[PDB]
Amino acid sequence: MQPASAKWYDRRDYVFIEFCVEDSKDVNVNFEKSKLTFSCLGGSDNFKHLNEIDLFHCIDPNDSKHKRTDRSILCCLRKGESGQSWPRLTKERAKLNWLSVDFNNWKDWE
Amino acid sequence: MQPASAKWYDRRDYVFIEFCVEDSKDVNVNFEKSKLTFSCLGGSDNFKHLNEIDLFHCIDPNDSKHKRTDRSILCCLRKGESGQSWPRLTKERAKLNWLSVDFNNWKDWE
């Protein structure tokens, strides 16, 4: 297995993470207060994907959700605090080779 | 003004920060989900103290409190999530020259 590639961006109250997996199945998103876990199989070859990250800021798991399509899986995380500033997605600064900013959707709402 | 010296430690559900200010007055503690702000005057000369820190993990402000004495001000922060692990007090890997671990009260409750 290996992490699915993903891009992220945020709004005032929400953080968005998109996992790019074609024809995904067994999609499994687990929202925690300070952690996110995504897993699924990709393609007819059942390619295993697993993404786990400690979030920079806390979120509200019970108010977070995800949508899936044949193209990818979009996660919507409710920021634990409105207007929360997210300079990065993860708790620690170290960069992840599968994660990048979604510049197509990025905005300076603040 | 300058930060008051302070030591910290945690238990399963709470994080404790003690600001060492003798004969404090105008004590002002502001608890926010991911931030703590402490200010006060020290001694007869009205020495100004101000401490601000972005917390490693989110806390529950509504359930946090502080107690003052002529010796110091002890803050009790309710962890946003029971059992939360706090390897450091601050969001970033920071060496704050005024902050140190309270080894007298420290425990490995885990």
Side-chain angles (χ1 to χ4, degrees), chain A residues 32-34 55-59 80-81 84 87-88 91-93, chain B residues 32-35 55-58 80-81 84 87-88 91-93:
Chain A
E32 231 82 85
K33 227 134 169 180
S34 55
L55 301 178
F56 180 69
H57 259 125
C58 61
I59 62 166
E81 182 164 51
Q84 235 169 12
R88 60 174 179 273
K91 181 73 80 197
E92 300 293 351
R93 254 182 49 221
Chain B
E32 294 190 74
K33 232 136 165 179
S34 54
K35 175 165 190 159
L55 299 176
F56 180 69
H57 260 125
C58 286
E81 181 165 49
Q84 238 171 12
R88 59 172 183 274
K91 179 73 77 197
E92 300 287 354
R93 286 248 180 61

Side-chain angles (χ1 to χ4, degrees), chain B residues 33-88:
Chain B
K33 232 136 165 179
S34 54
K35 175 165 190 159
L36 173 69
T37 296
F38 164 86
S39 57
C40 79
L41 302 177
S44 273
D45 53 327
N46 282 18
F47 197 75
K48 280 182 184 178
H49 281 121
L50 173 72
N51 296 72
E52 291 191 49
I53 63 172
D54 298 293
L55 299 176
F56 180 69
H57 260 125
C58 286
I59 62 168
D60 173 357
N62 208 269
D63 200 51
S64 300
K65 48 174 68 175
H66 72 279
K67 348 178 174 25
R68 180 214 108 89
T69 68
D70 287 350
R71 306 273 301 261
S72 60
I73 301 85
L74 176 58
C75 295
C76 178
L77 328 193
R78 170 63 174 283
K79 298 190 177 178
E81 181 165 49
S82 160
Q84 238 171 12
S85 191
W86 288 57
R88 59 172 183 274

Side-chain angles (χ1 to χ4, degrees), chain B residues 15-26:
Chain B
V15 173
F16 298 84
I17 308 162
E18 172 161 277
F19 301 94
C20 312
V21 190
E22 291 212 351
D23 318 319
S24 63
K25 70 171 86 78
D26 274 9

Side-chain angles (χ1 to χ4, degrees), chain A residues 37-63:
Chain A
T37 296
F38 165 87
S39 58
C40 77
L41 303 176
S44 50
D45 216 281
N46 284 20
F47 197 79
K48 279 184 186 178
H49 280 120
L50 177 70
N51 297 70
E52 290 192 49
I53 64 175
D54 298 290
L55 301 178
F56 180 69
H57 259 125
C58 61
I59 62 166
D60 176 355
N62 308 307
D63 202 49

